[PDB]
Amino acid sequence: GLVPRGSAVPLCKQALEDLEKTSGHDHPDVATMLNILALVYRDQNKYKEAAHLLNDALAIREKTLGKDHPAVAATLNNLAVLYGKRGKYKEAEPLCKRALEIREKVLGKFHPDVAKQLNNLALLCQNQGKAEEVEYYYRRALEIYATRLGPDDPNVAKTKNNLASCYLKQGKYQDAETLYKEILTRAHEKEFGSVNGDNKPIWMHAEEREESKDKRRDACKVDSPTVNTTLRSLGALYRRQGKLEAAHTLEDCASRNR
Amino acid sequence: LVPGSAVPLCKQALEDLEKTSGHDHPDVATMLNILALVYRDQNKYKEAAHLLNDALAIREKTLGKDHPAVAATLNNLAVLYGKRGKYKEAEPLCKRALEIREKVLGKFHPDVAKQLNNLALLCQNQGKAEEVEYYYRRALEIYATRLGPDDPNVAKTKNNLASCYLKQGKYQDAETLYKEILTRAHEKEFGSGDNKPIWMHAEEREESKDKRRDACKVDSPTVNTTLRSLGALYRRQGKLEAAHTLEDCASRNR
Amino acid sequence: LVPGSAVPLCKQALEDLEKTSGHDHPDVATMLNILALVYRDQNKYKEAAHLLNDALAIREKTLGKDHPAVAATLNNLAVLYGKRGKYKEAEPLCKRALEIREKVLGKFHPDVAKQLNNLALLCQNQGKAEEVEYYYRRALEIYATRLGPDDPNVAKTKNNLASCYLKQGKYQDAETLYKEILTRAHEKEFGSVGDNKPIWMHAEEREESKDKRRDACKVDSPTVNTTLRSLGALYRRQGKLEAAHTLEDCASRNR
Amino acid sequence: GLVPRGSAVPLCKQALEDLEKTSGHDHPDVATMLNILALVYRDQNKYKEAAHLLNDALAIREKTLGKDHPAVAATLNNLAVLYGKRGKYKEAEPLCKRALEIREKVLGKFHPDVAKQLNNLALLCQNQGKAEEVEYYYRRALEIYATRLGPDDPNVAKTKNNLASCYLKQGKYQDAETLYKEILTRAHEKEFGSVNGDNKPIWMHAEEREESKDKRRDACKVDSPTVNTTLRSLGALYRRQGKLEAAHTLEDCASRNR
């Protein structure tokens, strides 16, 4: 709460009433002031009050700027976020979906900011338990990240981890496994290059030690908070499959990078 | 959270108040504070801190050196200074806020703890390990008492204090803290010889030389971290099989 | 006096000083003052005054409430306030600058007069005629004494006080002042007076002798001309049109 | 003197040396900082020192921006001003004359800003006693003011007064007299609109009262600082010509508007 709880709201309301007297209600400057006031309310963790005003700012902006304006998308985003903070994910979704459409129209389907929007829509659907759809938006986002940015951009593996987790919820263990192994293979193929036959990724060592049931733990160097997550998540998969030694390989590898 | 046209419109509102009330008025300080909030939304932290320092100047002259609203401003300014890596400069301002908060609310009001937490964090980024130590301890004292012994904040602060010890090579003192946390969580559900914590089982599983690998009923995100941190300490000590007990337990709660 | 880009470049210099010395340092207050100067060059008096107030805040905490560099800041801030037409808020700042200046330099140091002159001008734009009166008299007191009785500033201040009297309907008090300036100027050239007579004496006697005849003329100064016409205006008010003509023709003959 | 006499120069010098180390000496930012430093010196009435730095700022700007850039015109104009403040009018003139050539090129011959530049050159030449050149520049300025702005713009009469004064120094009494009469005929008819024959300008009344052996001492509703100046100046002309009653008409008219 950067602004103290007293006097911020009434002083903003004055500044607002003053702008309304100059230009009338349907003016971009009123929408902007309504937006500043929403920012003040959000600073006090008053999400419902901020969303109510942002809705009023939204209607002004749709009229004066057009239903396809970038600032109309910015307002729909913020609104969805505010509904999300209240657990109102169902009613947030269409406003998020509407923001995506303007965003796609203005910037182009493959713009890195469309990727952020898609990521938010997937998140909204996830809190609703709509897995079919979480899956759709994460793929779309991954498609942008992996292509419009380098394949080893930090968002690639992050989105891949989120999508693998979505798969697990659906019981698509194969598709999750493949994703985790892609992240680990990519990271192994980045510090090294070709596999010499013994230049194997960690997960091949893991499964091969399960093959000869090796009760011994005593590949490491690969380091990232996201890769560590991948290492433990594939390890959780191996646990379900009853491959404890495999899990141990990846889990003990994760511990050494902590 | 905001969409140009924001700063300029605020600057009008400020001028209109200044016109009415004069510069030295709480409402002008507030409006500068509002304008700082807009700047911070645009990620302009130097500009935001400058305006908050202007708000501070007014509030000092109008409300007094020891006013609650002055403490809030000094704290917010310190947050902003911290965000630009100006930890050395934020420190005096954070100490000043603490003095006020202690005077106004008492030494042991929960809001003091959160202030003490920031002080610790401000010293850590400067590498003042001894002062971090003091501040976290001061915070823990309030958390473990004014809220329950098994409050989320208690275990968080104990991990944070433990990491501080780790940087000083006080492995003993860090160890003790992790055990306290786990022993509490094992005692929150049982407890309290007939009933041994996991770390005890772990160390007994090296005492018996038990290579056969893979109490395991604790559920908390903070406790997982604790388990992996103590296992890290066993690794340093060479007690690799003791590490596995706590780490496999963590994996099983993930 | 300068060509954009100046403010941004200054803000870097300012940030570099804060980085080195912290916010509460004289050099930061100075750089803010320098940045105020740049803003004032671009006619941005609001932004200039704001930065000077920031400089003031620093100099107060670092140098003290009574430091000469604070007085300079308070005065400069007041000038800028006045330029935006906020004379009410400029007044307290100006008074404080006077208190510091009196303390540090003495009551009667020439630099106090110019500060008293600002106060007078500041009170005038508010219409506080009694205050204006006090300040100009206080300033005159320093001018007529410290510098020579017939120093440029003495006649300037007498006219300014006389104009103040005119707004209050103190026509008689204004009249006296103009005659003082004219009698002094008639003494600096001719000597101790008669039958050396100042022009205003001849003028009123020309009215006294009902003479409508028309064109003493050895009094040269831009300030004296103003005085001649100002006293002529007073005679016009009184009805003494022939007395007015005498002083106004003398001014015309020195133009 | 808005900046305190101490430390302001060293701190600027620091800022400058920092810029020189980042972008080299021949960078516009160095020229701008040299300019800021010149502003600081001017605030302390150190004209010679401010001019020296501005000269260095000019050299950088001529090379980096080109010898015809508006900022080169601004620096030349600022430099002539400073020379003028030291009474160095001869050496100021070419620089001020160069600013005019750049200004004419960039804005066009009849831009109101060219009218101000011409006015400055006229001022420089006047301080030198070069009355033939003063005349040429005031005419050029008047030509712009009277056409690019309304005929009864404040600068029209101001420039006409300046030009009439220039004429008096040369002994061109008739040309001065004509100018004064134009300003008063303009203002008289701006008050009325049409001359009925009874509706005469003040100076016609002045010369007619001089004609008829008239006594005769006291149309005067024309209020302006620059018109009173015109009234007293034409009055001085009448005095010169021995027409005292005519002088008195205009002089008593100016007294009524004081």
Cα Rg of chain C, angstroms: 24
Q: How far apart are CA A180 and CA C120, in angstroms?
A: 81
Instruction: Enter the resolution in angstroms.
Output: 2.7
Q: How far apart are CA C8 and CA D19, in angstroms?
A: 13
- Contact (Cβ atoms closer than 8 angstroms) between residue D206 and residue D185: no
Q: Report the residue of chain B nearest A15, measured CA to CA.
A: B13
Which residues on chain B are in Cβ contact (under 8 Å) with A4?
30, 33, 69, 72-73
For chain B, the farthest-separated pair of C-alpha atoms sits apart, in whole angstroms, at: 81
CB contact under 8 A, A4 and B247: no
Q: How far apart are CA C38 and CA B175, in angstroms?
A: 60
Given CA atoms A135, A140, A146, A149 in this order, what sign does their dihedral have? negative
- Contact (Cβ atoms closer than 8 angstroms) between residue C62 and residue C25: yes
- Contact (Cβ atoms closer than 8 angstroms) between residue B87 and residue B52: no
Q: How far apart are CA C208 and CA C36, in angstroms?
A: 60
SS (H, E, C) chain C: CCCCCHHHHHHHHHHHHHHHHCCCCHHHHHHHHHHHHHHHHCCCHHHHHHHHHHHHHHHHHHHCCCCHHHHHHHHHHHHHHHHCCCHHHHHHHHHHHHHHHHHHHCCCCHHHHHHHHHHHHHHHCCCCHHHHHHHHHHHHHHHHHHCCCCCHHHHHHHHHHHHHHHHHCCHHHHHHHHHHHHHHHHHHHCCCCCCCCCHHHHHHHHHHCCCCCCCCCCCCCHHHHHHHHHHHHHHHHHCCHHHHHHHHHHHHHCC
Segment holding A176, helix H or strand E: helix A173-191
Buried residues in C44-62 as b, exposed as e (16+ CB within 10 A): ebebbbbbbbbbbbbbbeb
Other C-beta atoms lying within 10 Å of the C-beta of residue B80: 25
Which region, left, alpha or beta, applies to residue B136 given φ > 0 means left and ψ of -120 to 50 means alpha? alpha
Angle formed at CA D72 by CA D34 and CA D5, multiple of 5 degrees:
25
Task: Please state how this structure was obtained.
Answer: X-ray
Tokens of C227: 């005085």
- Contact (Cβ atoms closer than 8 angstroms) between residue B38 and residue B10: yes
Q: How far is B115 from chain C (nearest CA, A)?
A: 23
Q: How far apart are CA B218 and CA B201, in angstroms?
A: 14
Given CA atoms C98, C104, C107, C108 in this order, what sign does their dihedral have? negative
- Contact (Cβ atoms closer than 8 angstroms) between residue B59 and residue B73: yes
Q: How far apart are CA C1 and CA D82, in angstroms?
A: 10
Please report, for residues A26, A86, C219, D2, D256, the alpha-carbon distance to residue C199 in angstroms, rounded to integers and kept in the order given. 71, 90, 9, 43, 21
Q: What are phi and psi of B209, to 5 degrees?
A: 55, 60
Which residues on chain C are in Cβ contact (under 8 Å) with D218?
241
Closest to B11 measured CA to CA, from B51, B44, B41: B51
3-class secondary structure, A169: helix
Instruction: Tell whether A213 lies on the interface with B, counting CB pairs under 8 A.
Output: no
Q: How far apart are CA D39 and CA C41, in angstroms?
A: 9
- Contact (Cβ atoms closer than 8 angstroms) between residue A75 and residue A58: yes
Chain breaks in chain C (C to N over 2.5 A) after: 3, 193, 215
Angle formed at CA D206 by CA D205 and CA D211, multiple of 5 degrees:
95
Cβ-nearest to B247 among A15, A18, A255: A255
Residues 62-91 of chain A whose Cβ lies under 8 A from any Cβ of chain B: 71, 74-75, 78
Closest to B231 measured CA to CA, from C185, C74, A255, C77: A255
Q: How far apart are CA D141 and CA D148, in angstroms?
A: 10
CB contact under 8 A, B13 and A8: no
Segment holding A99, helix H or strand E: helix A89-107
Q: How far apart are CA B115 and CA B119, in angstroms?
A: 6
The amino acid at residue D255 is: S
DSSP A45: T
Closest to D256 measured CA to CA, from D219, D230, D206: D219
Q: How far is D134 from chain C (nearest CA, A)?
A: 22
Tokens of D177: 């007299």
Collect all residues with Cβ–Cβ distance below 8 Å to C71 and sequence separation of at least 6. Answer: C96, C97, C100, C101, C104
CB contact under 8 A, C6 and D35: yes
Q: How far is C71 from chain D (nearest CA, A)?
A: 10
Q: How far apart are CA C96 and CA C92, in angstroms?
A: 6
Q: How far apart are CA A231 and CA A217, in angstroms?
A: 15
Given CA atoms D136, D138, D141, D147 in this order, what sign does their dihedral have? negative
| DSSP assignments along B203-219, one per residue | HHHHHTT----------
Closest to D218 measured CA to CA, from A179, C242, A91, C16: C242
DSSP B108: T
Which residues on chain C are in Cβ contact (under 8 Å) with D51?
none
Q: How far apart are CA B153 and CA D245, in angstroms?
A: 100
Q: How far apart are CA C199 and CA C183, in angstroms?
A: 8
Length of chain D: 258
Which residues on chain D are in Cβ contact (under 8 Å) with C9?
15, 19, 29, 32-33, 36
Cβ-nearest to C30 among D11, D36, D74: D11
Closest to A179 measured CA to CA, from A230, A143, A223, A135: A230
CB contact under 8 A, C89 and B46: no
Collect all residues with Cβ–Cβ distance below 8 Å to A230 and sequence separation of at least 6. Answer: A157, A161, A180, A183, A184
Cβ-nearest to C5 among D32, D217, D251: D32
Tokens of A128: 């609703």
Tokens of B12: 């009008």
The amino acid at residue C53 is: N
- Contact (Cβ atoms closer than 8 angstroms) between residue A16 and residue A24: no
- Contact (Cβ atoms closer than 8 angstroms) between residue A129 and residue A151: no
- Contact (Cβ atoms closer than 8 angstroms) between residue B8 and residue A15: no
Cβ-nearest to C57 among B46, B57, B89: B57
Tokens of C66: 């009574």
Closest to D205 measured CA to CA, from D164, D158, D161, D252: D252
Cβ-nearest to C10 among D36, D217, D239: D36
3-class secondary structure, A190: helix
- Contact (Cβ atoms closer than 8 angstroms) between residue D18 and residue D30: no
Collect all residues with Cβ–Cβ distance below 8 Å to B86 and sequence separation of at least 6. Answer: none
- Contact (Cβ atoms closer than 8 angstroms) between residue A119 and residue A139: no
SS (H, E, C) chain D: CCCCCCCHHHHHHHHHHHHHHHHCCCCHHHHHHHHHHHHHHHHCCCHHHHHHHHHHHHHHHHHHCCCCCHHHHHHHHHHHHHHHCCCCHHHHHHHHHHHHHHHHHHHCCCCHHHHHHHHHHHHHHHCCCCHHHHHHHHHHHHHHHHHHCCCCCHHHHHHHHHHHHHHHHHCCHHHHHHHHHHHHHHHHHHHCCCCCCCCCCHHHHHHHHHHCCCCCCCCCCCCCHHHHHHHHHHHHHHHHCCCHHHHHHHHHHHHCCC
Q: Report the residue of chain A nearest B77, measured CA to CA.
A: A2
Q: How far apart are CA D154 and CA B38, in angstroms?
A: 45
- Contact (Cβ atoms closer than 8 angstroms) between residue B103 and residue B70: no
Q: How far apart are CA C80 and CA C7, in angstroms?
A: 18
Buried residues in A197-221 as b, exposed as e (16+ CB within 10 A): eeebbbbbbbbebbeeeeeebebee
Interface probe for B, chosen from A2, A76, A239 (most Cβ of B below 10 Å), is A2
Closest to D182 measured CA to CA, from D160, D166, D213, D165: D160
Q: How far apart are CA A95 and CA A101, in angstroms?
A: 10
Q: How far is CA B212 from the centre of its chain?
A: 40
Cis peptide before D256 (omega within 30 of 0): no
Q: What are phi and psi of A128, to 5 degrees?
A: -95, -15
Q: How far is C114 from chain B (nearest CA, A)?
A: 26
Q: How far apart are CA C50 and CA C45, in angstroms?
A: 9
Residues 116-175 of chain B whose Cβ lies under 8 A from any Cβ of chain A: none
Q: How far apart are CA D83 and CA A84, in angstroms?
A: 68
Instruction: Tell whether A42 lies on the interface with B, counting CB pairs under 8 A.
Output: yes
Q: How far apart are CA B224 and CA D109, in angstroms?
A: 81
What number of C-beta contacts closer than 8 Å exist between A and B?
Answer: 102
Q: How far apart are CA C31 and CA C55, in angstroms?
A: 8
Name the residue with tokens 């003095």.
B99
Q: How far is D159 from chain C (nearest CA, A)?
A: 20
Which residues on chain A are in Cβ contact (under 8 Å) with B214?
244, 248
- Contact (Cβ atoms closer than 8 angstroms) between residue B121 and residue B99: no
Collect all residues with Cβ–Cβ distance below 8 Å to C57 and sequence separation of at least 6. Answer: B57
CB contact under 8 A, D39 and C2: yes
Angle formed at CA C150 by CA C145 and CA C153, multiple of 5 degrees:
75
Task: Map out the domains of chain B with their CATH numbers.
Answer: 1-254 (1.25.40.10)
Name the residue with tokens 């390890």.
A235
Q: How far is D123 from chain C (nearest CA, A)?
A: 18
CB contact under 8 A, B34 and A11: yes
DSSP B25: S
Q: How far is B19 from chain C (nearest CA, A)?
A: 9
- Contact (Cβ atoms closer than 8 angstroms) between residue A51 and residue A77: no
Q: How far apart are CA A117 and CA A115, in angstroms?
A: 5
Cβ-nearest to D39 among C1, C26, C249: C1
Collect all residues with Cβ–Cβ distance below 8 Å to B61 and sequence separation of at least 6. Answer: B24
